[PDB]
Amino acid sequence: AQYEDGKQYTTLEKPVAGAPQVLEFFSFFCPHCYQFEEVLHISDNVKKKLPEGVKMTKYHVNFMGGDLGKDLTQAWAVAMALGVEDKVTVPLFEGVQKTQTIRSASDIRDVFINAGIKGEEYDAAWNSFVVKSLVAQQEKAAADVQLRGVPAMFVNGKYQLNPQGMDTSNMDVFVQQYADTVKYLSEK
Numbered sequence: 426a427q428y429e430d431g432k433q434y435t436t437l438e439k440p441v442a443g444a445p446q447v448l449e450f451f452s453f454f455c456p457h458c459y460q461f462e463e464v465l466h467i468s469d470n471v472k473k474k475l476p477e478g479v480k481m482t483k484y485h486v487n488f489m490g491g492d493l494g495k496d497l498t499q500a501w502a503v504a505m506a507l508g509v510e511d512k513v514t515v516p517l518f519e520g521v522q523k524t525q526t527i528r529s530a531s532d533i534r535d536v537f538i539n540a541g542i543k544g545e546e547y548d549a550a551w552n553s554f555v556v557k558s559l560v561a562q563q564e565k566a567a568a569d570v571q572l573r574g575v576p577a578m579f580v581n582g583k584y585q586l587n588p589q590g591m592d593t594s595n596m597d598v599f600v601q602q603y604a605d606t607v608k609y610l611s612e613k
């Protein structure tokens with residue numbers, strides 16, 4: 426067929442009950458994730474093709490970058506709690522990988538301050554149990570799919586995107602094939 430289990434996607438042996446509809450995992454330490462977000466804009470092109478009533482979830486992971494990787498997962502939780510993802514995604518990717526000016530939790534915090542999140546608002550979120558819960562949520566979803574690498578994307582806790590089994594020749598073609606595959610999967 427045109428879409429095949431094992432080709433553009435794979436099928437989890439242990440499907441995940443109740444998982445988010447479209448679930449993306451990334452790390453601000455992950456160079457391929459930088460490309461996905463800054464150059465390919467995968468998340469946004471997937472969204473632009475998703476059926477109505479399907480929501481996209483994006484979680485950070487701990488397994489890259491050691492101590493700072495874990496701080497970034499907490500900072501992504503802060504970004505979600507405040508709803509400022511679109512304000513800090515780029516400067517976090519660039520601070521970690523382009524300028525390499527993010528070396529500590531304080532440098533992470535500076536990015537939010539520079540984006541206009543007030544210092545008191547960031548600190549209260551950072552220390553909140555709402556944020557502790559979002560951290561564990563991100564960790565649980567990654568654990569549930571036994572996530573070893575990023576970037577990754579899952580649909581309905583059943584299908585894992587396989588960007589290698591796609592037509593990877595052209596890149597704009599690549600993005601749209603990735604996005605059409607997610608649409609197809611979300612329609613199964």
Ligand SMILES: O=C(O)c1sc(CCCc2ccccc2)nc1-c1ccccc1
Binds near residue numbers: 460465588593596599
């Ligand atoms: O598995 C993956 O992550 C992907 S994604 C992709 C196509 C993206 C092209 C591109 C454009 C701009 C910047 C970076 C990359 N190819 C692969 C691949 C991986 C292992 C072996 C062969 C192919």
